[PDB]
Amino acid sequence: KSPALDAVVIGAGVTGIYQAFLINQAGMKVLGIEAGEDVGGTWYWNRYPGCRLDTESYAYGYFALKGIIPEWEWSENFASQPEMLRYVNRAADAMDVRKHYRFNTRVTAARYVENDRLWEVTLDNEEVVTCRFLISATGPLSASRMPDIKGIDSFKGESFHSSRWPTDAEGAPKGVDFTGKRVGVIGTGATGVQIIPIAAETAKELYVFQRTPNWCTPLGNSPMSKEKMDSLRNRYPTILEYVKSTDTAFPYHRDPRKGTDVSESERDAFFEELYRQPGYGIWLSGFRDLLLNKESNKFLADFVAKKIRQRVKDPVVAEKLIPKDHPFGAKRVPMETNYYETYNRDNVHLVDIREAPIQEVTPEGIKTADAAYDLDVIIYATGFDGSLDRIDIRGKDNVRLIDAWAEGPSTYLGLQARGFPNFFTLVGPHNGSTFCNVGVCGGLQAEWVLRMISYMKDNGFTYSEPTQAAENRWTEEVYADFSRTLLAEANAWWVKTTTKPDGSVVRRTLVHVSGGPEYRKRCEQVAYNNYNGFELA
Numbered sequence: 001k002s003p004a005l006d007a008v009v010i011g012a013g014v015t016g017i018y019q020a021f022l023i024n025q026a027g028m029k030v031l032g033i034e035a036g037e038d039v040g041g042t043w044y045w046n047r048y049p050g051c052r053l054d055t056e057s058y059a060y061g062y063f064a065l066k067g068i069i070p071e072w073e074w075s076e077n078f079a080s081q082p083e084m085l086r087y088v089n090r091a092a093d094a095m096d097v098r099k100h101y102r103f104n105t106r107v108t109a110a111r112y113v114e115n116d117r118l119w120e121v122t123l124d125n126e127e128v129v130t131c132r133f134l135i136s137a138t139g140p141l142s143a144s145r146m147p148d149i150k151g152i153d154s155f156k157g158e159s160f161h162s163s164r165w166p167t168d169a170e171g172a173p174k175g176v177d178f179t180g181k182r183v184g185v186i187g188t189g190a191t192g193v194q195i196i197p198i199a200a201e202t203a204k205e206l207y208v209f210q211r212t213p214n215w216c217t218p219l220g221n222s223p224m225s226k227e228k229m230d231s232l233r234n235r236y237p238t239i240l241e242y243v244k245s246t247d248t249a250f251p252y253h254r255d256p257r258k259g260t261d262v263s264e265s266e267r268d269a270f271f272e273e274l275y276r277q278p279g280y281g282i283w284l285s286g287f288r289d290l291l292l293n294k295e296s297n298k299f300l301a302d303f304v305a306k307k308i309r310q311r312v313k314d315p316v317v318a319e320k321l322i323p324k325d326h327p328f329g330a331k332r333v334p335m336e337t338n339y340y341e342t343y344n345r346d347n348v349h350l351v352d353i354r355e356a357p358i359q360e361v362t363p364e365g366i367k368t369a370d371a372a373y374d375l376d377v378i379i380y381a382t383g384f385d386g387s388l389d390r391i392d393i394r395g396k397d398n399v400r401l402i403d404a405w406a407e408g409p410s411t412y413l414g415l416q417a418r419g420f421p422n423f424f425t426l427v428g429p430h431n432g433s434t435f436c437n438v439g440v441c442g443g444l445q446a447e448w449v450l451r452m453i454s455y456m457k458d459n460g461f462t463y464s465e466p467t468q469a470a471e472n473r474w475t476e477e478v479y480a481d482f483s484r485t486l487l488a489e490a491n492a493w494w495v496k497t498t499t500k501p502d503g504s505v506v507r508r509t510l511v512h513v514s515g516g517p518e519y520r521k522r523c524e525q526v527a528y529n530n531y532n533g534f535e536l537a
């Protein structure tokens with residue numbers, strides 16, 4: 001029996017529309033499925049106040065760079081979500097991709113039919129579609145869910161989660177004016193950190209509930225003159241080759257020096273100067289051993305801590321905002337606009353919930369182990385888990401994807417897992433998303449998958465699956481690259497260790513950290529050598 005589609009793509013964010021575009025372009029039949037009303041993914045769903053890029057708008061906008069909408073005009077150096085959402089829509093216009101999608105539609109299950117080499121795709125636990133290939137693009141981050149906190153539904157005031165902020169007919173967020181309300185914000189990752197300073201401008205009082213501080217550095221956002229935009233657009237051919245060559249696809253690359261190759265004075269100037277420069281330079285232009293060597297990371301950590309005490313009046317407030325938990329850059333660094341100067345305000349309080357954990361949410365507000373906080377509003381900036389885990393994906397022998405990866409994700413090329421043939425996992429932590437400029441990384445990985453699909457069609461092949469040897473090898477290499485860096489002991493739960501009954505040890509990182517150009521090259525060695533490592537029939 002023979003599938004109705006060549007490919008189904010789940011997701012209509014930047015990654016998934018580009019992939020769907022590419023397949024219809026190569027003249028094959030594709031069906032996109034999306035949950036939301038429309039294209040956008042991240043830029044469709046997150047509508048919280050202050051939601052902004054951390055990647056230069058000109059560098060994230062691969063669709064402009066690639067010549068699809070090159071005439072696009074960016075209004076700031078780091079676009080806000082509504083502008084981001086307009087960008088994705090215009091790209092969608094140009095690709096003409098929407099007509100290939102079913103919106104308002106959840107994929108509930110996906111099952112591999114080995115007799116027929118195809119995937120049955122279940123829409124809303126109702127309709128079934130068949131495709132030779134299934135491609136997930138379901139996003140590097142999973143879903144809005146309540147945090148694990150008792151009493152949530154009892155609060156008698158307004159309760160927002162950040163990824164589900166209510167909007168008006170215009171699509172703009174509502175209840176953003178907190179005049180004369182007492183507001184609680186839970187979470188200080190990148191989302192909290194964007195929301196807080198804006199919530200502070202109008203709230204009567206504002207309580208920040210923080211389990212662990214992150215390291216955050218200044219965004220340095222500013223408007224984009226028309227002159228600059230034209231200039232950038234003319235240099236798109238160069239910027240593209242440039243972003244294509246850096247390890248993150250950020251327009252930054254590491255300093256060629258070790259930290260100790262300079263004196264203390266010289267490191268200081270170097271740090272001072274980057275710190276004051278917009279964007280991620282402070283992180284991604286740093287010394288080459290910044291994430292490899294404790295002493296090198298301590299230089300910059302110390303420096304950022306100093307900046308934090310400079311910007312925070314109250315010494316005791318400040319030292320709670322400075323991590324000791326962890327090395328600098330060992331998570332994706334939140335970027336901010338006056339985040340620290342918010343806590344200098346009279347009406348703003350930092351609540352340390354490590355020392356005093358939330359005990360529960362109350363019709364009145366919030367209870368910690370040792371105080372109670374009356375609130376008129378609670379905003380849940382509690383972040384995300386993966387996204388595939390919410391679909392019942394079953395491969396050969398009816399094995400669940402979830403069980404296959406219990407001991408850690410296991411793939412070849414971060415793109416297919418053994419047991420799951422003809423299935424591609426685009427953009428996820430396990431193929432690099434965590435530290436990528438995903439506008440670019442995601443786009444390049446889609447074009448590769450398009451190349452493999454086209455090769456299978458051209459040779460009349462209908463079946464692909466990694467061998468066990470090629471999968472074990474890649475997975476051990478991904479782990480090994482990851483162990484050489486500081487993140488390995490930083491993020492204990494990013495590593496799955498299993499000691500199987502036979503008494504053997506398996507190590508897998510949840511997070512792939514190899515450089516992008518080096519990873520794409522290994523992909524191209526594979527593709528050119530007739531997809532050596534995949535079984536093909």
Ligand SMILES: Cc1cc2nc3c(=O)[nH]c(=O)nc-3n(C[C@H](O)[C@H](O)[C@H](O)COP(=O)(O)OP(=O)(O)OC[C@H]3O[C@@H](n4cnc5c(N)ncnc54)[C@H](O)[C@@H]3O)c2cc1C
Nearest residue numbers: 011013014015035041042053054055106107138139437438
């Ligand atoms: C607030 C925020 C800011 C960010 N800023 C940056 C940045 O500056 N730079 C950067 O590189 N990255 C950033 N990211 C990461 C971001 O995820 C990527 O930039 C990019 O948007 C990922 O696109 P995607 O298409 O791969 O996934 P997504 O944008 O998450 O799109 C996934 C889509 O598929 C849908 N879907 C999921 N499951 C199903 C299903 N079961 N059935 C039907 N549809 C489904 C979802 O509803 C969603 O529309 C940010 C993320 C967030 C949340």
Ligand SMILES: NC(=O)c1ccc[n+]([C@@H]2O[C@H](COP(=O)([O-])OP(=O)(O)OC[C@H]3O[C@@H](n4cnc5c(N)ncnc54)[C@H](OP(=O)(O)O)[C@@H]3O)[C@@H](O)[C@H]2O)c1
Nearest residue numbers: 052053054147148187188189190191192211212332382383
């Ligand atoms: N472009 C940008 O500047 C930008 C903006 C938004 C998001 N992003 C991306 O989105 C990712 C996630 O960001 P995020 O801000 O949504 O989440 P996050 O960084 O994963 O953290 C969510 C916050 O909530 C806390 N928390 C989680 N569960 C809790 C609970 N049950 N009770 C109390 N506190 C809890 C966490 O503290 P603990 O650390 O102790 O768990 C953390 O500070 C980031 O890694 C970033 O890459 C980027």
